[PDB]
Design a protein around this ligand. Sequence first.
Ligand SMILES: [Zn+2]
Ligand SMILES: [Zn+2]
Ligand SMILES: [Zn+2]
Ligand SMILES: [Zn+2]
Ligand SMILES: [Zn+2]
Lengths: 90, 95
Amino acid sequence: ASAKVIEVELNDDYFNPNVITIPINESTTLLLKNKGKSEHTFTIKKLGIDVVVESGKEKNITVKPKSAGTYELICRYHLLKGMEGKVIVK
Amino acid sequence: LAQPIASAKVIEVELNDDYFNPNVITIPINESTTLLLKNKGKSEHTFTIKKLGIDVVVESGKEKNITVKPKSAGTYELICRYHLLKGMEGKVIVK
Ligand SMILES: [Zn+2]
Ligand SMILES: [Zn+2]
Ligand SMILES: [Zn+2]
Ligand SMILES: [Zn+2]
Ligand SMILES: [Zn+2]
């Protein structure tokens, strides 16, 4: 099991990277860094993830997906401006 | 006590990406004013006046009414909680 923390930048108004891959049946720590001037969310509904991150702040979350597939990542505030991504569990 | 339906005056406030229009509104103390909040932007926004205990979230392309009856004169900060740092703020003057 990797000690690697997966880092995701939230900026105005996009995720970087906008595709991430995490291992099935393992705990992965994600470091969510909001480098933008707006509040953003990191939301993966089908994985039960919904995190709000203040501008200039970061949060760690731990995810342990049990089903392989490609899951929708969105920011709830900016979905219509293209702030979405794909989270691949394999 | 009875009055006709929708007697309170209505002030429209536009929420767009990322500003309020108008960004200064004046409302009478100890009277009810209705605020019609219209989100004309592509982002979710809030209409938040912390010192008046107001916090309304409006989804893109939607609208919401809120009626307020402030008890103290002053100038209150209006913000969008998501975009305050992008300049999305205003002033609510109660007099
Ligand atoms: Zn966002
Ligand atoms: Zn998608
Ligand atoms: Zn925004
Ligand atoms: Zn806003
Ligand atoms: Zn101000």
